[PDB]
Structure 1
Amino acid sequence: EEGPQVKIREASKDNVDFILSNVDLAMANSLRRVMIAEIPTLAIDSVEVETNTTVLADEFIAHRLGLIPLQSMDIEQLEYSRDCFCEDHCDKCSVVLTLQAFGESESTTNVYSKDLVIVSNLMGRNIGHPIIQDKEGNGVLICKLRKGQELKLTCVAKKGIAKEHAKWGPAAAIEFEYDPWNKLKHTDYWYEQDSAKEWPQSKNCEYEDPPNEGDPFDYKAQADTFYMNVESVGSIPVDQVVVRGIDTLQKKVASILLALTQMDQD
């Protein structure tokens, strides 16, 4: 197209190996990071225990309900409880899940990411669904319990990003590499006898022209073409963790212009 191109190598529902080409390392990383920590998601953030007899103590469980990824497709149309005006929270700012388990079976009763029950009105929008990729469709084993062990909670998922806390992260890992044949000499391989012998060459050594002695040191050498790979957790589709990444990082850069503006007036 126009500026920094892409060229998706493999790709799936849980990963997007692609080649970011014709960009500044800076920008590549910036995006790298944005993905990792500032993309809005949705997660349980408040847990009201009414009853619990499990062996796991209250907060122990709570903590977990946080990492249980939830649906965050339209998270971009839900509000940050903090910016909404409802004293505390509302359907306009949050989702309300529920959990109730009782050991009936004479055999260990299992509580899963599935047993969560949305109670608030989703005013029609994909959000708040305990994301399941589990093969049997149960996902994330919240906790087990014996004979008559009960457990009644209530959850309140809200917006929120990674900086605020991890559970709101959506990325989880992100392969990043460039210049597979150390050509700009950005590293200084350690060795005993041979650099090449001891140090494994990467999958990406291919997609780039090997060194070849003779030639002098390319010092004018810049650095474009980055072999990335944005995995995903679910909360948002692999593709998203990259587009919304590219976006947020953009709005961020935006606000800086906007700020510079109000600045003028006064």
Structure 2
Amino acid sequence: SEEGPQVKIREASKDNVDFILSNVDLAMANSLRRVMIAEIPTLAIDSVEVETNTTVLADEFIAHRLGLIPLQSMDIEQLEYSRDCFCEDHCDKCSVVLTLQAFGESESTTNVYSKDLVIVSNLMGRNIGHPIIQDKEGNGVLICKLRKGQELKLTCVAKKGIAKEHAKWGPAAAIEFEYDPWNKLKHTDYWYEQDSAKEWPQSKNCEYEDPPNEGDPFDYKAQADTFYMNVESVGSIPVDQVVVRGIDTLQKKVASILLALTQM
């Protein structure tokens, strides 16, 4: 369609998208996956105040587990960094406050999932703060376990951040990456004992490129332009939005460079 980088999508799901990147140099795709990992913002719990802990765990143990919980961040652009906002500690425009209270009343063991998180703060109409739940049973991810007579009562403030400050604000899980399945560019020297071709397995992506003929000389001036990616998201942000927001954040960093150049 548009003149420049091309995308062809092999497969797409709610949780991951496998696609092909064409007419792009390597550094662009590498910076794209780097941004997808670390530079794109989300929302996760960055403060925990515990009222009573009768559990077998420590408080900071549970706090770390809470920080790792995937929260909704689709409308995270409307949320602001708590360091950028003007409130005293955390307002409704810079944070989302959750409450978690559970008591062990059954003789059997009680489970504290992430679905037992309730949102106290006012959302102001934004689609954020909801714990992500993909368990077919509907329960959240397991947070803790309780004996009859034990209780856990605490309040979690969730702020806006990126992965570089802490890996909890990670929108993606694992970005697959392969270029030149046939090593046509001689970018790696295959280690072998008898036959490099028979000892190494063929990649899945070998189908989408034509095999080289052994009589052909080394196509040397050719550079890498066609890449095979598979982006997977935890659920904080949908996959399409993970890659699109990564593109946008890369644009934003280059634009900040340009504005610094202008103000110089």
| TM-score calculated relative to the size of structure 2 | 0.99
2:119 corresponding residue in structure 1: 118
Q: Distance in 1 between matches of 2:64 and 2:200?
A: 41
Query: Percent same amino acid at aligned positions?
Result: 100
Q: Distance in 2 between matches of 1:249 and 1:136?
A: 38
Q: Over residues 52-75 of structure 1, what are the superposed CA-to-partner deviations in whole Å (9 max), with x where a residue is unaligned?
A: 111010000000001110000110
SS at match of 1:35: helix
Q: Distance in 2 between matches of 1:123 and 1:107?
A: 39
1:40 corresponding residue in structure 2: 41
Q: Distance in 2 between matches of 1:25 and 1:99?
A: 46
Q: Distance in 2 between matches of 1:151 and 1:132?
A: 21
Q: Distance in 1 between matches of 2:212 and 2:114?
A: 51
SS at match of 1:204: helix
Cα displacement (A) at 1:123:
0.2
Structure 1: 4+ residue segments shifted above 6 A: none
Cα displacement (A) at 1:156:
0.4
Q: Distance in 1 between matches of 2:22 and 2:138?
A: 39
SS at match of 2:132: coil
Q: Over residues 223-246 of structure 1, what are the superposed CA-to-partner deviations in whole Å (9 max), with x where a residue is unaligned?
A: 011100110000000111100011
Q: Distance in 2 between matches of 1:214 and 1:68?
A: 55
Q: Over residues 129-165 of structure 1, what are the superposed CA-to-partner deviations in whole Å (9 max), with x where a residue is unaligned?
A: 0111111111210000101000001000000000010
Q: Distance in 2 between matches of 1:125 and 1:136?
A: 26
Q: Distance in 1 between matches of 2:112 and 2:175?
A: 31
Cα displacement (A) at 1:221:
1.2
| Larger strand fraction of residues | 2
Cα displacement (A) at 1:85:
0.2
Q: Over residues 73-103 of structure 1, what are the superposed CA-to-partner deviations in whole Å (9 max), with x where a residue is unaligned?
A: 1101101000000011100100000000000
Q: Distance in 2 between matches of 1:254 and 1:16?
A: 28
Q: Over residues 93-135 of structure 1, what are the superposed CA-to-partner deviations in whole Å (9 max), with x where a residue is unaligned?
A: 0000000000011110000110000000000011000111111
Q: Over residues 31-55 of structure 1, what are the superposed CA-to-partner deviations in whole Å (9 max), with x where a residue is unaligned?
A: 0110000110000000000001110
Q: Distance in 2 between matches of 1:90 and 1:181?
A: 55
Q: Distance in 1 between matches of 2:113 and 2:87?
A: 31
Cα displacement (A) at 1:25:
0.5
2:205 corresponding residue in structure 1: 204
Q: Distance in 1 between matches of 2:262 and 2:164?
A: 27
Q: Distance in 1 between matches of 2:204 and 2:198?
A: 16
State how many pairs are aligned: 263
1:52 matched to 2:48? The reply is no
Q: Distance in 1 between matches of 2:230 and 2:253?
A: 23
2:140 corresponding residue in structure 1: 139
Task: Kindly report the root-mean-square deviation, in angstroms, between the aligned alpha carbons of the 2 structures.
Answer: 0.5
Unaligned ranges ≥5, structure 1:
none
Cα displacement (A) at 1:211:
1.1
Q: Distance in 2 between matches of 1:251 and 1:10?
A: 28
1:232 corresponding residue in structure 2: 233
SS at match of 2:8: coil
Q: Distance in 1 between matches of 2:204 and 2:140?
A: 33
| TM-score calculated relative to the size of structure 1 | 0.98
Q: Over residues 170-229 of structure 1, what are the superposed CA-to-partner deviations in whole Å (9 max), with x where a residue is unaligned?
A: 111100000000100000000000000000110100100111111111110100111001
Cα displacement (A) at 1:2:
1.1
Q: Distance in 2 between matches of 1:261 and 1:223?
A: 33
Q: Distance in 2 between matches of 1:152 and 1:203?
A: 50
Q: Distance in 1 between matches of 2:99 and 2:21?
A: 42
Q: Over residues 19-40 of structure 1, what are the superposed CA-to-partner deviations in whole Å (9 max), with x where a residue is unaligned?
A: 0111000001100110000110
